[PDB]
Amino acid sequence: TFFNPDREGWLLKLGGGRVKTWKRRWFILTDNCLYYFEYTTDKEPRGIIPLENLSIREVEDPRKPNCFELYNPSHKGQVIKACKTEADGRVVEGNHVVYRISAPSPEEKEEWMKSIKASISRDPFYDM
């Protein structure tokens, strides 16, 4: 799956739960999904966030620079389809309405946003 990726790189991801903490993950954009790994050479992704139907927007954050958000525009407060692993082996659906992401630089933010937008638009099943 991870052959011929559209982009890879480090991003920070804000965790979707009650306290919410930032975690540094290695992301791979491929097959119109964002896969993320704890460490770059990990065999198994920690999660997958399919991009189909999603949109992207810039946001400003109090603590993290170079941020954007993925969200589902079709319905407000709609949960984003996604899946992750837990250390005990559970494979669970995500519970995010938004994914806030911080890129390592303004340049990388622009590159990631452009790559994500292009991937969403190339999907032949986009907006259906």
mmCIF file of all heavy atoms in Angstrom, residues 76-105:
data_model
loop_
_atom_site.group_PDB
_atom_site.id
_atom_site.type_symbol
_atom_site.label_atom_id
_atom_site.label_comp_id
_atom_site.label_asym_id
_atom_site.label_seq_id
_atom_site.Cartn_x
_atom_site.Cartn_y
_atom_site.Cartn_z
ATOM 1 N N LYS A 76 -22.415 19.174 9.587
ATOM 2 C CA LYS A 76 -21.660 19.731 10.721
ATOM 3 C C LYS A 76 -21.660 18.767 11.912
ATOM 4 O O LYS A 76 -22.674 18.124 12.203
ATOM 5 C CB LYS A 76 -22.233 21.088 11.131
ATOM 6 C CG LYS A 76 -22.198 22.137 10.031
ATOM 7 C CD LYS A 76 -22.549 23.514 10.569
ATOM 8 C CE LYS A 76 -22.513 24.562 9.468
ATOM 9 N NZ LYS A 76 -22.856 25.917 9.980
ATOM 10 N N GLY A 77 -20.511 18.657 12.578
ATOM 11 C CA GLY A 77 -20.353 17.750 13.702
ATOM 12 C C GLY A 77 -20.433 16.281 13.322
ATOM 13 O O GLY A 77 -20.625 15.429 14.190
ATOM 14 N N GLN A 78 -20.299 15.975 12.031
ATOM 15 C CA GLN A 78 -20.309 14.588 11.583
ATOM 16 C C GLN A 78 -18.948 13.978 11.901
ATOM 17 O O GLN A 78 -17.915 14.624 11.702
ATOM 18 C CB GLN A 78 -20.590 14.482 10.084
ATOM 19 C CG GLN A 78 -20.501 13.049 9.544
ATOM 20 C CD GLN A 78 -21.554 12.730 8.503
ATOM 21 O OE1 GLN A 78 -22.133 11.638 8.517
ATOM 22 N NE2 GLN A 78 -21.807 13.673 7.594
ATOM 23 N N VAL A 79 -18.962 12.744 12.400
ATOM 24 C CA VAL A 79 -17.732 12.045 12.773
ATOM 25 C C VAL A 79 -16.993 11.622 11.510
ATOM 26 O O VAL A 79 -17.599 11.126 10.555
ATOM 27 C CB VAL A 79 -18.019 10.815 13.681
ATOM 28 C CG1 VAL A 79 -16.839 9.852 13.719
ATOM 29 C CG2 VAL A 79 -18.358 11.275 15.090
ATOM 30 N N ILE A 80 -15.679 11.831 11.515
ATOM 31 C CA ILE A 80 -14.837 11.452 10.395
ATOM 32 C C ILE A 80 -14.560 9.957 10.478
ATOM 33 O O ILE A 80 -14.110 9.448 11.515
ATOM 34 C CB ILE A 80 -13.517 12.260 10.422
ATOM 35 C CG1 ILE A 80 -13.804 13.753 10.239
ATOM 36 C CG2 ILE A 80 -12.551 11.760 9.346
ATOM 37 C CD1 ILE A 80 -12.711 14.662 10.753
ATOM 38 N N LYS A 81 -14.852 9.251 9.397
ATOM 39 C CA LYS A 81 -14.481 7.857 9.284
ATOM 40 C C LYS A 81 -12.968 7.770 9.418
ATOM 41 O O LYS A 81 -12.238 8.518 8.768
ATOM 42 C CB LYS A 81 -14.922 7.289 7.945
ATOM 43 C CG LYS A 81 -14.635 5.810 7.764
ATOM 44 C CD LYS A 81 -14.911 5.384 6.324
ATOM 45 C CE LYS A 81 -14.412 3.981 6.048
ATOM 46 N NZ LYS A 81 -14.452 3.686 4.586
ATOM 47 N N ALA A 82 -12.525 6.874 10.288
ATOM 48 C CA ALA A 82 -11.106 6.638 10.538
ATOM 49 C C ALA A 82 -10.989 5.399 11.410
ATOM 50 O O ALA A 82 -11.970 4.976 12.023
ATOM 51 C CB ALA A 82 -10.483 7.826 11.226
ATOM 52 N N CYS A 83 -9.794 4.822 11.462
ATOM 53 C CA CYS A 83 -9.542 3.633 12.262
ATOM 54 C C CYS A 83 -8.162 3.755 12.910
ATOM 55 O O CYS A 83 -7.257 4.354 12.337
ATOM 56 C CB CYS A 83 -9.622 2.398 11.371
ATOM 57 S SG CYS A 83 -9.561 0.813 12.213
ATOM 58 N N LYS A 84 -8.009 3.211 14.108
ATOM 59 C CA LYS A 84 -6.694 3.166 14.754
ATOM 60 C C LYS A 84 -6.497 1.882 15.548
ATOM 61 O O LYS A 84 -7.454 1.162 15.826
ATOM 62 C CB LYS A 84 -6.499 4.382 15.666
ATOM 63 C CG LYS A 84 -7.506 4.484 16.794
ATOM 64 C CD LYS A 84 -7.141 5.596 17.776
ATOM 65 C CE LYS A 84 -8.136 5.668 18.941
ATOM 66 N NZ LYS A 84 -7.476 6.025 20.233
ATOM 67 N N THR A 85 -5.246 1.593 15.894
ATOM 68 C CA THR A 85 -4.939 0.513 16.836
ATOM 69 C C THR A 85 -4.699 1.063 18.239
ATOM 70 O O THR A 85 -4.354 2.230 18.413
ATOM 71 C CB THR A 85 -3.712 -0.281 16.396
ATOM 72 O OG1 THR A 85 -2.549 0.569 16.389
ATOM 73 C CG2 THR A 85 -3.853 -0.763 14.969
ATOM 74 N N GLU A 86 -4.914 0.205 19.234
ATOM 75 C CA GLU A 86 -4.535 0.464 20.613
ATOM 76 C C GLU A 86 -3.470 -0.557 20.973
ATOM 77 O O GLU A 86 -3.358 -1.589 20.319
ATOM 78 C CB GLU A 86 -5.753 0.332 21.528
ATOM 79 C CG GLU A 86 -6.961 1.157 21.089
ATOM 80 C CD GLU A 86 -6.838 2.632 21.420
ATOM 81 O OE1 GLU A 86 -5.787 3.059 21.945
ATOM 82 O OE2 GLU A 86 -7.813 3.370 21.165
ATOM 83 N N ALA A 87 -2.676 -0.270 22.000
ATOM 84 C CA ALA A 87 -1.563 -1.152 22.371
ATOM 85 C C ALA A 87 -2.033 -2.567 22.751
ATOM 86 O O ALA A 87 -1.339 -3.557 22.485
ATOM 87 C CB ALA A 87 -0.741 -0.530 23.511
ATOM 88 N N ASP A 88 -3.221 -2.675 23.338
ATOM 89 C CA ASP A 88 -3.744 -3.994 23.728
ATOM 90 C C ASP A 88 -4.275 -4.819 22.550
ATOM 91 O O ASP A 88 -4.756 -5.937 22.742
ATOM 92 C CB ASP A 88 -4.818 -3.860 24.807
ATOM 93 C CG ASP A 88 -6.055 -3.132 24.323
ATOM 94 O OD1 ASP A 88 -6.222 -2.953 23.095
ATOM 95 O OD2 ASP A 88 -6.908 -2.682 25.111
ATOM 96 N N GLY A 89 -4.216 -4.257 21.345
ATOM 97 C CA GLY A 89 -4.553 -4.983 20.136
ATOM 98 C C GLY A 89 -5.908 -4.632 19.531
ATOM 99 O O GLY A 89 -6.192 -5.054 18.412
ATOM 100 N N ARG A 90 -6.728 -3.865 20.252
ATOM 101 C CA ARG A 90 -8.011 -3.379 19.725
ATOM 102 C C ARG A 90 -7.830 -2.582 18.433
ATOM 103 O O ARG A 90 -6.900 -1.785 18.311
ATOM 104 C CB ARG A 90 -8.708 -2.457 20.722
ATOM 105 C CG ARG A 90 -9.607 -3.128 21.754
ATOM 106 C CD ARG A 90 -10.268 -2.106 22.686
ATOM 107 N NE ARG A 90 -9.238 -1.358 23.416
ATOM 108 C CZ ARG A 90 -9.297 -0.073 23.775
ATOM 109 N NH1 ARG A 90 -10.363 0.679 23.525
ATOM 110 N NH2 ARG A 90 -8.262 0.459 24.419
ATOM 111 N N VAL A 91 -8.738 -2.796 17.489
ATOM 112 C CA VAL A 91 -8.822 -2.009 16.270
ATOM 113 C C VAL A 91 -10.141 -1.245 16.376
ATOM 114 O O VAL A 91 -11.214 -1.852 16.350
ATOM 115 C CB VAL A 91 -8.781 -2.919 15.028
ATOM 116 C CG1 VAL A 91 -8.884 -2.113 13.748
ATOM 117 C CG2 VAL A 91 -7.499 -3.771 15.035
ATOM 118 N N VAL A 92 -10.060 0.073 16.528
ATOM 119 C CA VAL A 92 -11.235 0.887 16.840
ATOM 120 C C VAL A 92 -11.496 2.007 15.836
ATOM 121 O O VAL A 92 -10.570 2.517 15.218
ATOM 122 C CB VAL A 92 -11.118 1.501 18.247
ATOM 123 C CG1 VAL A 92 -10.830 0.406 19.282
ATOM 124 C CG2 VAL A 92 -10.037 2.571 18.297
ATOM 125 N N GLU A 93 -12.766 2.383 15.681
ATOM 126 C CA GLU A 93 -13.130 3.524 14.840
ATOM 127 C C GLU A 93 -12.770 4.819 15.557
ATOM 128 O O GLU A 93 -12.810 4.891 16.783
ATOM 129 C CB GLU A 93 -14.612 3.464 14.467
ATOM 130 C CG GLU A 93 -15.008 2.215 13.697
ATOM 131 C CD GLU A 93 -16.482 2.190 13.346
ATOM 132 O OE1 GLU A 93 -17.195 3.150 13.705
ATOM 133 O OE2 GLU A 93 -16.926 1.210 12.710
ATOM 134 N N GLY A 94 -12.416 5.850 14.797
ATOM 135 C CA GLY A 94 -12.089 7.136 15.376
ATOM 136 C C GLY A 94 -13.351 7.848 15.836
ATOM 137 O O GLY A 94 -14.442 7.519 15.383
ATOM 138 N N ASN A 95 -13.190 8.820 16.726
ATOM 139 C CA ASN A 95 -14.310 9.603 17.251
ATOM 140 C C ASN A 95 -14.125 11.108 17.029
ATOM 141 O O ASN A 95 -14.661 11.918 17.788
ATOM 142 C CB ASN A 95 -14.495 9.339 18.747
ATOM 143 C CG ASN A 95 -14.781 7.882 19.051
ATOM 144 O OD1 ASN A 95 -15.525 7.221 18.325
ATOM 145 N ND2 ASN A 95 -14.190 7.375 20.126
ATOM 146 N N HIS A 96 -13.358 11.493 16.010
ATOM 147 C CA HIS A 96 -13.088 12.912 15.766
ATOM 148 C C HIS A 96 -14.144 13.526 14.874
ATOM 149 O O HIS A 96 -14.604 12.881 13.940
ATOM 150 C CB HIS A 96 -11.730 13.114 15.089
ATOM 151 C CG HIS A 96 -10.569 13.057 16.029
ATOM 152 N ND1 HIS A 96 -9.442 13.831 15.864
ATOM 153 C CD2 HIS A 96 -10.359 12.319 17.144
ATOM 154 C CE1 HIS A 96 -8.577 13.555 16.823
ATOM 155 N NE2 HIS A 96 -9.111 12.643 17.615
ATOM 156 N N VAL A 97 -14.507 14.775 15.164
ATOM 157 C CA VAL A 97 -15.281 15.583 14.228
ATOM 158 C C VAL A 97 -14.328 16.427 13.389
ATOM 159 O O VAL A 97 -14.622 16.702 12.224
ATOM 160 C CB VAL A 97 -16.371 16.459 14.919
ATOM 161 C CG1 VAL A 97 -17.568 15.598 15.295
ATOM 162 C CG2 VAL A 97 -15.838 17.186 16.151
ATOM 163 N N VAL A 98 -13.193 16.821 13.979
ATOM 164 C CA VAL A 98 -12.079 17.430 13.243
ATOM 165 C C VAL A 98 -10.731 16.775 13.586
ATOM 166 O O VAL A 98 -10.556 16.237 14.681
ATOM 167 C CB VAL A 98 -11.952 18.954 13.518
ATOM 168 C CG1 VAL A 98 -13.296 19.658 13.320
ATOM 169 C CG2 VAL A 98 -11.408 19.225 14.916
ATOM 170 N N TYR A 99 -9.792 16.825 12.641
ATOM 171 C CA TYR A 99 -8.392 16.502 12.902
ATOM 172 C C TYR A 99 -7.601 17.777 12.726
ATOM 173 O O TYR A 99 -7.499 18.294 11.616
ATOM 174 C CB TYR A 99 -7.859 15.429 11.940
ATOM 175 C CG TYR A 99 -8.329 14.051 12.284
ATOM 176 C CD1 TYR A 99 -9.369 13.461 11.583
ATOM 177 C CD2 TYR A 99 -7.752 13.339 13.330
ATOM 178 C CE1 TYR A 99 -9.827 12.200 11.910
ATOM 179 C CE2 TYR A 99 -8.201 12.072 13.671
ATOM 180 C CZ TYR A 99 -9.249 11.509 12.953
ATOM 181 O OH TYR A 99 -9.710 10.252 13.249
ATOM 182 N N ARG A 100 -7.066 18.296 13.822
ATOM 183 C CA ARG A 100 -6.162 19.418 13.784
ATOM 184 C C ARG A 100 -4.728 18.903 13.709
ATOM 185 O O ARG A 100 -4.321 18.064 14.506
ATOM 186 C CB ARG A 100 -6.322 20.298 15.022
ATOM 187 C CG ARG A 100 -5.519 21.574 14.917
ATOM 188 C CD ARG A 100 -5.805 22.604 15.997
ATOM 189 N NE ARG A 100 -7.127 23.198 15.825
ATOM 190 C CZ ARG A 100 -7.508 24.355 16.358
ATOM 191 N NH1 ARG A 100 -6.673 25.065 17.097
ATOM 192 N NH2 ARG A 100 -8.738 24.808 16.143
ATOM 193 N N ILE A 101 -3.978 19.449 12.757
ATOM 194 C CA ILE A 101 -2.634 19.003 12.413
ATOM 195 C C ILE A 101 -1.717 20.211 12.404
ATOM 196 O O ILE A 101 -2.100 21.270 11.908
ATOM 197 C CB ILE A 101 -2.635 18.380 10.992
ATOM 198 C CG1 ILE A 101 -3.682 17.268 10.857
ATOM 199 C CG2 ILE A 101 -1.246 17.868 10.630
ATOM 200 C CD1 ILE A 101 -3.433 16.074 11.701
ATOM 201 N N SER A 102 -0.512 20.044 12.941
ATOM 202 C CA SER A 102 0.538 21.050 12.892
ATOM 203 C C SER A 102 1.731 20.536 12.102
ATOM 204 O O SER A 102 2.309 19.504 12.437
ATOM 205 C CB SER A 102 0.980 21.408 14.313
ATOM 206 O OG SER A 102 2.120 22.246 14.334
ATOM 207 N N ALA A 103 2.124 21.286 11.078
ATOM 208 C CA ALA A 103 3.269 20.931 10.250
ATOM 209 C C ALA A 103 4.558 21.571 10.780
ATOM 210 O O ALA A 103 4.514 22.598 11.467
ATOM 211 C CB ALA A 103 3.013 21.351 8.814
ATOM 212 N N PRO A 104 5.712 20.978 10.471
ATOM 213 C CA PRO A 104 6.990 21.469 11.017
ATOM 214 C C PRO A 104 7.430 22.865 10.536
ATOM 215 O O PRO A 104 8.256 23.477 11.202
ATOM 216 C CB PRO A 104 8.007 20.398 10.579
ATOM 217 C CG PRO A 104 7.193 19.226 10.125
ATOM 218 C CD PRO A 104 5.892 19.775 9.632
ATOM 219 N N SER A 105 6.891 23.346 9.417
ATOM 220 C CA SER A 105 7.209 24.666 8.890
ATOM 221 C C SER A 105 6.045 25.196 8.066
ATOM 222 O O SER A 105 5.162 24.427 7.670
ATOM 223 C CB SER A 105 8.491 24.616 8.036
ATOM 224 O OG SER A 105 8.296 23.879 6.839
#
